[PDB]
Amino acid sequence: PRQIPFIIGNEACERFSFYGMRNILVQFLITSLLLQEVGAPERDAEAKHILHSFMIGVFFFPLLGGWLADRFFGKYTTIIWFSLIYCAGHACLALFEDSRSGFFVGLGLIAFGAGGIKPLVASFMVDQFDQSNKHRAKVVFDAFYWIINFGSLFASLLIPLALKHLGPSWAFGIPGILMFIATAVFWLGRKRYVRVPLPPKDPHGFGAVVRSALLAHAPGQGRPGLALAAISVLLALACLGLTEQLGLVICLCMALVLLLAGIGGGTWWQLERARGTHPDAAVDGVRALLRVLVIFALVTPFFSLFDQKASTWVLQGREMRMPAWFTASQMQALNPLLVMLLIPFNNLVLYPLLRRLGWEPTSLRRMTSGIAFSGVAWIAVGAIQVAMDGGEPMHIAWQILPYALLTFGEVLVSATGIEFAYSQAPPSMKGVVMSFWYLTTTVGNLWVLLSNVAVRNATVTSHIADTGLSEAAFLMFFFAAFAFLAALAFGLYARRYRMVDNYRPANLYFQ
Ligand SMILES: CCCCCCC/C=C/CCCCCC(=O)OC[C@@H](O)CO
Ligand SMILES: CCCCCCC/C=C/CCCCCC(=O)OC[C@@H](O)CO
Ligand SMILES: CCCCCCC/C=C/CCCCCC(=O)OC[C@@H](O)CO
Ligand SMILES: CCCCCCC/C=C/CCCCCC(=O)OC[C@@H](O)CO
Ligand SMILES: CCCCCCC/C=C/CCCCCC(=O)OC[C@@H](O)CO
Ligand SMILES: CCCCCCC/C=C/CCCCCC(=O)OC[C@@H](O)CO
Ligand SMILES: CCCCCCC/C=C\CCCCCC(=O)OC[C@@H](O)CO
Ligand SMILES: CCCCCCC/C=C\CCCCCC(=O)OC[C@@H](O)CO
Ligand SMILES: CCCCCCC/C=C\CCCCCC(=O)OC[C@@H](O)CO
Ligand SMILES: CCCCCCC/C=C\CCCCCC(=O)OC[C@@H](O)CO
Ligand SMILES: CCCCCCC/C=C\CCCCCC(=O)OC[C@@H](O)CO
Ligand SMILES: CCCCCCC/C=C\CCCCCC(=O)OC[C@@H](O)CO
Ligand SMILES: CCCCCCC/C=C\CCCCCC(=O)OC[C@@H](O)CO
Ligand SMILES: CCCCCCC/C=C\CCCCCC(=O)OC[C@@H](O)CO
Ligand SMILES: CCCCCCC/C=C\CCCCCC(=O)OC[C@@H](O)CO
């Protein structure tokens, strides 16, 4: 279709721009006048707080983007308006580089813009193909895989060099211009796009079945699931009262986790009461979605460990030996390079080997192994830190070891997770699966924010100061242990999981 190049152009510029600004954020922040803390470990925590709060927004706002597009404006209009807000955020990073208030408004606008378009770009692309040629979108999804990885790789190698040698106006200015170009290119194909109707309200969709499950009465029982859901709404509201000691972003996230557990768990309790009102394939479909929500919840520590390569690992990298021309942030280029090497290594070498050897590399085995390997990566990061803390000069090339381990974990759990959930949930409920997957990253980033608060406590600080390890080394070993515990909890849940496939072919678009 003649409109597809405008979509490819917009996707390439926006992805390069996103990774470009995100992957220099902590290195820019740590030497800036934008941090209010004065002590070195307090400033590390503050820079992590900003990055991980930004990641929270990026992966939470798809909820708003999808809702506005599906219920009111369609995908084209929603993409355009979120992309312009996105541009305004990039312009704020320019207009307010030396202003804490303006630069944070800029990050807020970028998070909102990037988050809002995220569940829309891929869906709008598929809409461009006629209903009998939907399978041909696979070729474009394959191009998105290469575009995301090459864009992330180049952004990680180039933008930190612009920061180091040219300064912040150039380093944030380049992604800003690319986002303007991404928005302009999307707009240039406007007269050629297919603009499909708003999705019809499904009387047997996820929301309707949850509504019927919670509200339906049963003789001589009552409604304890609705009660649990009501109590979770009250506990979520109580969180807004902890803004003083935890900050608004943590409070809003803890409230989100409470609402997911209470309403989800409450729906699980009374889901059988929907069986009459709904066609069974709808009720079973919601049961399958709730089992997926548990699998996704258990994967959140992987994202706690994964998203810290742009914060905690950069901060470590800065203290390591390197040539004058190199900068710590450039190490982030190893992740997309390793994804591009390891996706075909696992697909063409490792999985076929394992299959021939008798150990079937099932989707749940890959996921358990994936969380465990992210834990192993953090044992390596911590061991590197312990060598650094003991006065040993460590070359930054030592970070290749945890990058390899972590990216191996990513290919095993992150690339598998979404494909696994799609295979188990009804294909008509794919949007719900995706919303829960985005929230998996939001929740993993919350665990990082919570760890920052926990270490700032004078009692925890004294326990750390007595442990012998630095705050960074303690936190690294803590995250490794957290991933190992998560791998164990995931594996025990996976053991009792019954695979019930939908038998509908689907996907290299996981990042
Ligand atoms: C349900 C969760 C929604 C969260 C929305 C988050 C919106 C994104 C914001 C990115 C900018 C982060 C600025 C935070 C910040 O610097 O806080 C001040 C902090 O340094 C004090 O410790
Ligand atoms: C390591 C952190 C794990 C907790 C993450 C919290 C995110 C929220 C998750 C929703 C709660 C689980 C849903 C409960 C539910 O429906 O269970 C059904 C389950 O028993 C099916 O086997
Ligand atoms: C510096 C290049 C980074 C990107 C690496 C991409 C690796 C993907 C290769 C495609 C699948 C293997 C096809 C068979 C083949 O010719 O393998 C040789 C070589 O590509 C193996 O890395
Ligand atoms: C199946 C994959 C297994 C991978 C095993 C490796 C996992 C990590 C182990 C910790 C070693 C981290 C490297 C740090 C190190 O060697 O520092 C000591 C020394 O070199 C300091 O001069
Ligand atoms: C996708 C490409 C990523 C490129 C960066 C990651 C590879 C590691 C680089 C370490 C910093 C540059 C040092 C170059 C150099 O002289 O290397 C020799 C060094 O390995 C000896 O220890
Ligand atoms: C040419 C093939 C390279 C394959 C690399 C990917 C597999 C992972 C390897 C682990 C590398 C460990 C780090 C080695 C390192 O930095 O040594 C320390 C040395 O640079 C000190 O000068
Ligand atoms: C590089 C040279 C080309 C310059 C292109 C200039 C236009 C740039 C960006 C798009 C502006 C969008 C303005 C808002 C708009 O059209 O909204 C329509 C919306 O309300 C309904 O779909
Ligand atoms: C000291 C500077 C603080 C900077 C704070 C940054 C805030 C920036 C952007 C957020 C824009 C408001 C979006 C809120 C909104 O309408 O969300 C509705 C949504 O929660 C419904 O799901
Ligand atoms: C593993 C290969 C990945 C692709 C590499 C793409 C290269 C793009 C950007 C980074 C270039 C950095 C080169 C800087 C450099 O070597 O400077 C040395 C300096 O002393 C001048 O001689
Ligand atoms: C897509 C962006 C294109 C425009 C920007 C291209 C420039 C990229 C990176 C900066 C290169 C370093 C410039 C030379 C320089 O000052 O070297 C540092 C040092 O040798 C002197 O202080
Ligand atoms: C589209 C990709 C290629 C990008 C090429 C470079 C043009 C992009 C952005 C322009 C940024 C200009 C920043 C001007 C500025 O404030 O300079 C002040 C000072 O830093 C001068 O060195
Ligand atoms: C619907 C989303 C709206 C956007 C929300 C954006 C929130 C942005 C910034 C909040 C900054 C909180 C500052 C307070 C804080 O965290 O203080 C540190 C605390 O540990 C007390 O020492
Ligand atoms: C279409 C995109 C714009 C085309 C421009 C691509 C620019 C590619 C690479 C940037 C040059 C990196 C070289 C950095 C370098 O060696 O700096 C000097 C050195 O002494 C300090 O790093
Ligand atoms: C510091 C906490 C350590 C906790 C132990 C971590 C062990 C590492 C990875 C988890 C492996 C999977 C757990 C066992 C499991 O579920 O096995 C089921 C399997 O036998 C079915 O074939
Ligand atoms: C600390 C070293 C970590 C190394 C990687 C972790 C160990 C490797 C594989 C464990 C996979 C357990 C998966 C459990 C699972 O899905 O069981 C379901 C199965 O029993 C259904 O028949």
Q: Domain segments of the chain: what residues?
A: 1-511
Q: Tell me the CA–centroid distance for residue 165 and ligand 10, in Å.
A: 6
* Residue with CA closest to ligand 5 atom 15: 323
- DSSP assignment of 235-291 equals HHHHHGGGHHHH-HHHHHHHHHHHHHHHHHHHHHHHGGGGTTTS-SHHHHHHHHHHH
Q: Are 168 and 159 in contact (CB under 8 A)?
A: no
Ligand 5 atom at shortest distance from the alpha carbon of 153: 1
Gap between the Cα atoms of 167 and 88, Å rounded:
20
What lines the ligand 9 site, CB under 6 Å? 157-158, 325
What's the rounded Cα separation, in Å, for the pair 303 and 142?
Answer: 24
Contact 13, 178 (CB under 8 A): yes
Nearest CA to ligand 6 atom 21: 395
Asked whether the beta carbons of 59 and 115 are under 8 A apart, the reply is yes
C-alpha–C-alpha distance, residues 409 and 370, integer Å: 4
Three-class SS string for 30-60?
HCCCCCCCCCHHHHHHHHHHHHHHHHHHHHH
CA gap 334, 180 in Å, rounded: 27
Solving technique for this entry?
Answer: X-ray
103 with 34: CB under 8 angstroms? yes
Residue at token pair 């070729």: 139
Q: Judge contact between 58 and 119, C-beta under 8 A.
A: no
The contacts found for 69-78 with CB under 8 angstroms, 24 or more apart, are 69/120, 70/198, 70/199, 70/431, 71/198, 72/198, 74/195, 74/196, 74/198, 75/120, 75/123, 75/124, 75/127, 75/195, 75/196, 76/124, 76/190, 76/193, 76/195, 78/116, 78/117, 78/120
Question: Amino acid identity, residue 185?
Answer: V
One-letter amino acid at 181 equals I
Angle separating helix axes 248-270 and 40-60, nearest 10 degrees: 40
> Which two tokens mark 386?
């312990």
Chain breaks in the chain (C to N over 2.5 A) after: 506
- For residue 333, give both structure tokens: 């280029």
DSSP state of 72: I
Other CB atoms within 10 Å distance of the CB of residue 489: 15
CATH topology of domain 1-511: Growth Hormone; Chain: A; (1.20.1250)
Please tell me the distance between residue 155's alpha carbon and the centre of ligand 7 in angstroms: 25
Q: Ligand 10, residues 163, 164, 165, 170: which to mutate, most atoms within 8 A of Cβ?
A: 165
Assess whether the C-beta atom of 167 lies below 6 angstroms from ligand 11.
Answer: yes
Ligand 11 centre to CA of 175 (Å) is 10
Contact at 8 Å (CB) between 473 and 386?
yes
* Nearest CA residue ID for atom 11, ligand 3: 344
Q: Whose CA is nearest to atom 7 of ligand 7?
A: 184
Find the 374 Cα to ligand 7 centroid distance in Å: 42
Q: Is 117 in the pocket of ligand 4 (CB under 6 A)?
A: no
Q: Provide φ and ψ at 237, rounded to 5°.
A: -65, -40
- How remote is the CA of residue 55 from the centroid of ligand 7, in Å? 27
> How long, in residues, is the chain?
511
* Beta carbons of 430 and 354 less than 8 angstroms apart: no
* Rounded distance from Cα 25 to ligand 5 centre (Å): 22
Distance from the CA of 345 to the center of ligand 6, in angstroms? 18
d(CA 97, CA 125): 35
- Distance (Å, whole) CA 259 – CA 240: 13
DSSP per-residue letters across 400-465 = HHHHHHHHHHHHHHHHHHHHHHHHHS-GGGHHHHHHHHHHHHHHHHHHHHHHHHHHHSHHHHHHHH
